[PDB]
Structure 1
Amino acid sequence: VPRMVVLHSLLGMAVLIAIAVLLSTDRKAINIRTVAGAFLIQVALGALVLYVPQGRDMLGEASKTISNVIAYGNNGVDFLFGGLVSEKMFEVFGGGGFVFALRVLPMIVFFSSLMAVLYYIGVMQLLIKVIGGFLQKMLGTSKAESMSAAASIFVGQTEAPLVVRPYIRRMTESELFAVMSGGLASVAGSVLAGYVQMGVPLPYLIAASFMAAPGGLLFAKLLVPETERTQNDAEVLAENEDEKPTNVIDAAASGAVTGAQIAIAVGASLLAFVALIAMINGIIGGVGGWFGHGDLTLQAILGWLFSPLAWVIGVPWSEAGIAGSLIGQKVVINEFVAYSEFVKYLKPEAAVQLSDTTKAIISFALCGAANLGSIAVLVGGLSIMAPKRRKDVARLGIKAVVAGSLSNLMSAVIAGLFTGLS
């Protein structure tokens, strides 16, 4: 079994990289040290947090630490919404007692105000500089895209990294794509906690975030390798007067209001997406009713379509029909809807129970902002810092989603590998 698992996984890793090479603008310019490093660093962390006992003790400890934060986050939620989030909801409404708009969306606000404190203190600047510095010293990427890849971990496509603000205007084609892919390879800390309250495995989300930094650079440099010259740090003297908050109280409140609009936007989009798909299911169910079928849903159609891809990652074909739908929904719609239907299988009451090695894969394969919807979020926000580069960002929109998705898929193979071995 293990000799076949490491073979089924290595083959899975081979296919994913092969796709990037085929879609590469210049396969000859592919710096091996940078792409072999990005692939090695990514798979190295998998052996760190999912295999070796020393790291799993740390990953578990890290989960317990962050779980406290969330437990502290609810102390403000219990104050606000009162008993609408109590255990009395599961006695009265039972399963319906779990209000998604009150258990998940408010957590988006708190974490946004939490990191805003960490950014003001300088905690993030400490972690970004280290992780960012480590990448360029092991790969060969510029200072900008390296710091961006480290900043993309804690913050997805939501907030601008700002650590590359004086760089973005004049980055190379490959450098610009690395930033875009990084934001689509990872998720924000705010939406990360949102998945946790839904039922998504916390230790898996922690590993998935840090895997998105080298994985986000892997398929970024594969699709578009570096050809031009990286901008010098002494010649890029063009820093405009940046406005900053006053104290930690101002920062803590600024992050809350900023995360408030996010929570409202998420809940509004989800109210539409869940409803719109249900409407299409009525149309497909109607059209499918003429010949065949006519129970046919968009859930099932995306299943057979992404079934081959799901099998490549490590999910058995028998269960690829389910994993295919979830990965599909993530890319063509969003990761929130995909996660909403993934937690349905995690329930012990659920009829269809999957294997632990499969649930691990899907958890990593879904963790990512790589969808058709996050394109405009990038282009819309990235154009502010670079108004004369908006044409380049818009073109690499779909290309970055692929690089962002493949990053999640690559991290998912690593999951199915080491969790299949241990």
Structure 2
Amino acid sequence: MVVLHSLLGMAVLIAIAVLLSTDRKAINIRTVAGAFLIQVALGALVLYVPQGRDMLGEASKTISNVIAYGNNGVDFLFGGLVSEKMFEVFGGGGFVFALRVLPMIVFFSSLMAVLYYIGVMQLLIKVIGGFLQKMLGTSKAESMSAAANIFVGQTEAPLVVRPYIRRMTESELFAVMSGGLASVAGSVLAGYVQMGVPLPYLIAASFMAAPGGLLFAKLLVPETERTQNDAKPTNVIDAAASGAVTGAQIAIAVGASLLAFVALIAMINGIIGGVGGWFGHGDLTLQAILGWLFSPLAWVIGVPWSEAGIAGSLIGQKVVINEFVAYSEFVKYLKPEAAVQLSDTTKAIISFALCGFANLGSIAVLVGGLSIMAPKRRKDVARLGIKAVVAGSLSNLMSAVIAGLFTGLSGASVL
């Protein structure tokens, strides 16, 4: 039974979290059982029942329209280098990453800046964040962080509650970090889409990341102390421009990091290839090692053993490098001309498991940005780095288990 394989996976994830908990006898049951109940509720809502799949389908239509609007600005700026004739000439190379993926960071950063300026995002965060604190009993600040994290990046997310950060507790801070590592940004989300990644999965994952982030944040470090209970751009054109420039230099940083990471990985594979020549192989790669290593974890979360090696590589690459490298090697399996055709339930698991910033490199990003908001807490942030990555990774896997289960029930994923 699929439900047995999924419930087992959920059991493993929750068990590992408790074993890594700082105070196991201090764990708030109402919070974590409520959080787990919400994440699986949203899971059943968007992936199982027809009404929710239609609502999710309408959302995909809307945001894709927005992405298309962004591409109008991309077509204007980069002319025919993003035209259709690129494939007619360069074939697969017709898809230029730096011109089709990175500019979406620029557009959405400006769009989010406009939405913040109008007052739309404050409303959405206040509503969703309010629902969380009312159900889970978490504080207001860490709750608002999760809602922001659904839409914006891990660094931009706590900005809405940034004066509360310098005084907030150990658990509240970790919850902000975990909620940050569990969720992507809307900017890079459209980036994944332009690479070929299924949009509806990314939407659902972004919403599930908020309670899932809180789930493993209250499991690893439950609230042991007292909380703190309480309660600019010139014009709209300035906000749009300010967001564009911000998203521009972010995109340059992202594009430069990927160019370096990919090249370094190939360099490592060259080293492992030579040294591994005496090990009886020589054709060994880092991808295979990660896949062979993370193979058990892939099988636990619902992936068949035949594809557990593949899923292991993608999950492995995600944590040690980033999600972009993972998704870049993942879309290669989504091609209809692929030698190895993945199952539908597998693709859903991976799509949810990979949707997160939880990696070794995001730690320094957290440290830098979260310190600018709270400099005296900088030592605390860097200390909770690894544990937060774990919390974020477990949140992604929880969403993956839930996803693979509901696709095993009534399946759906267009090629």
TM-score class normalised by the smaller sequence: over 0.9
Distance 1:57 1:86 in 2: 32
- 3-state SS of the aligned residue for 2:303? coil
Distance 2:81 2:130 in 1: 46
Question: Cα distance, 1:52 vs. partner?
Answer: 0.6
Structure 2 match to 1:289: 277
The reply to whether residue 6 of structure 1 matches residue 18 of structure 2 is no
Distance 1:329 1:182 in 2: 21
Structure 2 match to 1:180: 177
Structure 1 match to 2:82: 85
Distance 1:80 1:158 in 2: 28
Contact 1:360 1:412 in 2 (8 A): yes
Distance 1:105 1:286 in 2: 35
Question: Cα distance, 1:165 vs. partner?
Answer: 1.1
Question: Cα distance, 1:391 vs. partner?
Answer: 1.1
- 3-state SS of the aligned residue for 1:157? coil
Question: Cα distance, 1:163 vs. partner?
Answer: 2.1
Distance 1:210 1:357 in 2: 20
Contact 1:155 1:183 in 2 (8 A): no
Question: Cα distance, 1:164 vs. partner?
Answer: 1.5
- 3-state SS of the aligned residue for 1:232? coil
Distance 1:69 1:142 in 2: 33
Contact 1:219 1:406 in 2 (8 A): yes
Question: Cα distance, 1:292 vs. partner?
Answer: 1.1
Contact 1:178 1:216 in 2 (8 A): yes
The reply to whether residue 111 of structure 1 matches residue 99 of structure 2 is no
Question: Cα distance, 1:161 vs. partner?
Answer: 2.6
The reply to whether residue 41 of structure 1 matches residue 38 of structure 2 is yes
Distance 2:373 2:100 in 1: 34
Distance 2:17 2:247 in 1: 35
TM-score norm. by structure 1 comes to 0.96
Contact 1:160 1:382 in 2 (8 A): no
Question: Cα distance, 1:155 vs. partner?
Answer: 1.4
Aligned CA RMSD, in angstroms, stands at 0.7
Question: Cα distance, 1:385 vs. partner?
Answer: 1.3
Distance 1:59 1:273 in 2: 34
Distance 2:175 2:276 in 1: 42
- 3-state SS of the aligned residue for 2:160? coil
Contact 2:155 2:370 in 1 (8 A): no
Structure 2 match to 1:381: 369
Deviations 1:224-265 (A, max 9, x none): 0011011131xxxxxxxxxx1111100000100000011101
Deviates more, 1:287-296 or 1:174-183: 287-296
C-alpha change, 1:160 and 1:50, in structure 2 (3 Å) is: closer
- 3-state SS of the aligned residue for 1:354? coil
The reply to whether residue 137 of structure 1 matches residue 125 of structure 2 is no
Distance 2:97 2:344 in 1: 26
Deviations 1:29-81 (A, max 9, x none): 00000000010000000010000111111100000001101111111111111
Question: Cα distance, 1:156 vs. partner?
Answer: 2.4
- List runs of 5+ in structure 2 lacking aligned partners: 410-415
TM-score norm. by structure 2 comes to 0.97
Contact 1:152 1:186 in 2 (8 A): yes
- List runs of 5+ in structure 1 lacking aligned partners: 234-243
Question: Cα distance, 1:158 vs. partner?
Answer: 3.6
Distance 2:352 2:229 in 1: 36
Distance 1:10 1:232 in 2: 36
Distance 2:343 2:357 in 1: 25
Deviations 1:177-205 (A, max 9, x none): 00000110001111111111001000000
- 3-state SS of the aligned residue for 2:195? coil
Contact 1:157 1:374 in 2 (8 A): no
Contact 2:213 2:392 in 1 (8 A): yes
Deviations 1:127-166 (A, max 9, x none): 0000000001101101111111111111122424322212
Contact 2:106 2:244 in 1 (8 A): yes
Contact 1:160 1:381 in 2 (8 A): no
Deviations 1:325-364 (A, max 9, x none): 0000000111000010000000001111100000000000
Deviates more, 1:77-86 or 1:359-368: 77-86
Distance 2:234 2:8 in 1: 53
Contact 2:299 2:308 in 1 (8 A): yes
Contact 1:73 1:107 in 2 (8 A): yes
Structure 1 match to 2:12: 15
Contact 2:70 2:104 in 1 (8 A): yes
Contact 2:208 2:399 in 1 (8 A): yes
Question: Cα distance, 1:318 vs. partner?
Answer: 1.2
Structure 2 match to 1:357: 345
The reply to whether residue 301 of structure 1 matches residue 298 of structure 2 is no
Distance 1:89 1:349 in 2: 20
Distance 1:226 1:364 in 2: 28
Give aligned pairs, total: 408
Contact 2:148 2:157 in 1 (8 A): no
Distance 1:303 1:260 in 2: 34
Contact 1:155 1:161 in 2 (8 A): no
- 3-state SS of the aligned residue for 2:157? coil
Contact 1:116 1:251 in 2 (8 A): yes
